[PDB]
Amino acid sequence: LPLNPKPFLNGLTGKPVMVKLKWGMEYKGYLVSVDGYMNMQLANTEEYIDGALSGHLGEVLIRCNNVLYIRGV
Amino acid sequence: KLVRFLMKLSHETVTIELKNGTQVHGTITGVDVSMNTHLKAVKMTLKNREPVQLETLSIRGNNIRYFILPDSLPLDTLLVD
Amino acid sequence: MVQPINLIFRYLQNRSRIQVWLYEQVNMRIEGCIIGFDEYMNLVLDDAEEIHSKTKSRKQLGRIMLKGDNITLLQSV
Amino acid sequence: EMTPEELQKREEEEFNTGPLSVLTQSVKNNTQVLINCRNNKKLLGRVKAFDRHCNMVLENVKEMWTEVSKPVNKDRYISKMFLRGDSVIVVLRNPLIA
Amino acid sequence: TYQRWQFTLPMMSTLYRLANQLLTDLVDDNYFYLFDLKAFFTSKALNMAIPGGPK
Amino acid sequence: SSKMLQHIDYRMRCILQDGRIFIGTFKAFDKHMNLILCDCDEFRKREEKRVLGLVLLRGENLVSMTVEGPPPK
Amino acid sequence: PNVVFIKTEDPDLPAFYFDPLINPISHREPLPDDDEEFELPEFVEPFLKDTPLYTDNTANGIALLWAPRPFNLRSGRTRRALDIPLVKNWYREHCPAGQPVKVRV
Amino acid sequence: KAHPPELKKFMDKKLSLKLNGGRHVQGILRGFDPFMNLVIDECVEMATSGQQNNIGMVVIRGNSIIMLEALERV
Amino acid sequence: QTLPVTVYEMDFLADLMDNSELIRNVTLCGHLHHGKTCFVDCLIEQTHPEIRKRYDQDLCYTDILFTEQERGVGIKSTPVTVVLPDTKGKSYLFNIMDTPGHVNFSDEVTAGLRISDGVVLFIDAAEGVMLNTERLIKHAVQERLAVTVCINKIDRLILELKLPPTDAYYKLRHIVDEVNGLISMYSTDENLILSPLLGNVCFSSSQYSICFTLGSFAKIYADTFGDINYQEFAKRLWGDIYFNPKTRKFTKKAPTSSSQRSFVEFILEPLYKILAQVVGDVDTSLPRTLDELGIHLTKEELKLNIRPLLRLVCKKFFGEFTGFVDMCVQHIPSPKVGAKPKIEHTYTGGVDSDLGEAMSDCDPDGPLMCHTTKMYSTDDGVQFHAFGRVLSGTIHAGQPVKVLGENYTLEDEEDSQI
Amino acid sequence: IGVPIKVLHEAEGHIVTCETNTGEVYRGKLIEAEDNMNCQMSNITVTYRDGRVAQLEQVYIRGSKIRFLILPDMLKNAPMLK
């Protein structure tokens, strides 16, 4: 089953996932939207600095040159 | 394009901070489509070093962190394509 | 001759134990099983896990989408 | 790109249902925005407009960074700014406090 | 004053076709071999006679 | 791009991303800000003069340039 | 060098034609394989493919290239009518065979 | 517009690559793309620790490549 | 000193001699009157803006004797030193020796091949291989030099014979096959196969300034349309290979019965159409053709006669002669690399001696070794100038030197002078 | 194409010395160069950041990591710079 990353991000949009950035911090939230350039927009996310909770900030637009990877749960 | 917005603001005394923390107070002269900022009347305070006088400066557009604009600028007639 | 995109295609044919390196990150590496690529070499991993160099604590990641602007090496086992 | 047409209006459909539409609400509803940028600075203000490179124009902003002594956060006021888009970590709509 | 002229190429083709009776069929200077002005000056300076040439 | 056609043969200072100083005669440029500078002197900070010669500087490592002196005869 | 220009006798023939005064050429390299498929972009064309190979003025234009003076020209100055000899080539070329003695003299 | 790198002189030779964080690797070059991504056979690891680890047929993305070194004569 | 206006600075030519990799020592030769000195005239016009051909007469810039002007033939081999750019834009230093093509002056070629490394053989496309060409192939193989062949006078296939295109291709293929046969008769090297796909055979017309290989005309396509790998495109413009307009590919089998070869379809027929629209249709359809090809002319330039207008159109179209530079760099070695068979062939005492190993590297300092073959007279004739090449070391003005003659041995030491 | 790339192709065959982003200085004869700064060089003296001098006989440098190059001084009379 060929699962390219672009139908992965256009198919599993809406489920609560977590992105991780280059600096080592993690965003817990469900994906609202994503383009062909792989900019992402996720809602009501939560901030983990190295796995530790910091506070409430809101919904986040994340850019190409900031993200490290995109995993689930 | 917003960079095409930047070339409509010539002859304005703005400040520019780059990615190295260097701050430049000066009058802007030239704006390229790659945001290559050609300045004159330059007061350049490098981060943790002494401020210097410069006559003409040429900043490459990639290494720009941000601009700061004065209070007397009507942008509402300047963003119109 | 072999071009590297056909070898990534052979990797997703073989579902091998791909260990991916990272740009600027000499410590933190990721094991995974590749499924697909694109034109900009963005890579999904089936069962990914994170391995440090001084700590070496294997944590579970799942099916990740690691970007093209981060990877360095696609090695096996 | 498979769309070489001259009438290119996908970049505003990018601004409506795409990821960048977060800023267009702050163009239309004029909401407060918080920006984490690369030398550890926090910029809170109101963005006027932007583009596909996220080259933004902001007005009436307060921006903070901490200094180390031990790290204490300092703040400063700026009336108006232009911010280049590659120099950001994240752009944030501040939530409804109410 | 009727001093300079320039023509078009079909006109020159027609004027070359009509004047075919006065013009020879020569194509190169491999003709006139030992029958040109320098050989005639050499025969003048050496006081000899080319077969068909002048005396 | 006539602002860099005006800067031709001027004795100009160049600041790198590393903080080093390239002072050279402005011979040639392009759209990627690649510099051809003849008879270049390098200043670093302890101050010292380091003679280079003909320098082909890549645009990725150039930050800002300024003018120091008039062109020689 | 021998000018090998061959005159055209039939105007209905094409301007570039294998005139069989020319001797026939006797008939019989690192050619790459078709698998390494090189493909041109779609707007690539050979030069001047809309223009034909020969027109009506082609053979006449080639024939005027080997014409004597001034028929190989296309521009010049006028000459006064008593400075144009019309007999000069005739006694300049050679004597024809079978002519009498006084004509040769 | 992106022309492929002239790597025909270094095909099937033993080269050592330098990578971003002071990293080092060795192996046989087997091909490339016009984005300078490299396929390496018989890839031994050779980190800064000094111990050698063979892997096999690997792919290096070009963005972290610093330098090639031809151990074999070209 | 006073010098004519030249497109490059003379200090560049002074500083370029110090690198022995960027030099080529090339001898041009061929049969009698197959276009050697006119090609040298075209190179001089390329390198000098103020030197141009007369509208009615040949220039003959390298024919300086009065006998060479009155007879109309070449007598003495004459050198020239120029700087030429290649296709990609790199400057190179060429030392070009024009040798006379008449058979009785074959001794002027042997003195030219002693001090050179590569041979450029000019062959008339109309006459083909003749006596002196067959003798000079033998004399270039037996002296162990690299051989390249340039086919001159292709306009005689256009304006004199009026030949069909595939028949002219057959003519060029027969000439190249005859060259390959004369190479394979005398050479023991099986790697001396000449073919235009290898960049080894160049095509030219000296009277109208035409010079192209496959790579230069592919570079013309890449400069006209863009996004074309011209070095890969030039690998398939010779032989029985066909452009299929359906799949846009180069296939060895026939798409149709009327499908022309790729060399006819892409290269030779546009040349026919340029010459046809200049010669036959100068009055009606020439501005449309010049507007399609991208060449603009002045109204005063449009009133010229047919031959200078055709030379001007071909010069504005093809431009600089880069294919000849590419051929003479690719298939002729540098004097640093090609020094070893020269020392093995020409130096008495073998290459295995101490001085042969020193001359085998072309060392610009050390033992000064020079070999002079040619003697030129002055305007007065009271004294002569020696002419040769510098094998090793650097020769200086005012330096005392030791001249060694042909009767010198180490046992005798009689034929020597300071 | 621009002006400095023609100067880079002009300096082929000569001894250039290049410094890259890792602070390493490579001096030797430039064999090949392209439109981008991919430089194939030979007979290389290698200076590290600490100061070790090495002799590496074939080096191929990616153009992305290059800080700058240092070219020979006789290129001021080159035709494209005049």
Ligand SMILES: Nc1nc2c(ncn2[C@@H]2O[C@H](COP(=O)(O)OP(=O)(O)OP(=O)(O)O)[C@@H](O)[C@H]2O)c(=O)[nH]1
């Ligand atoms: N048709 C035509 N004639 C040419 C061409 N090149 C040269 N010729 C003519 O042929 C004649 C001889 O040319 P040269 O260059 O003098 O011949 P050459 O090879 O120097 O003779 P050598 O003195 O033996 O070297 C002259 O009339 C030239 O104009 C060409 O491309 N086409």
Ligand SMILES: [Mg+2]
């Ligand atoms: Mg001659």
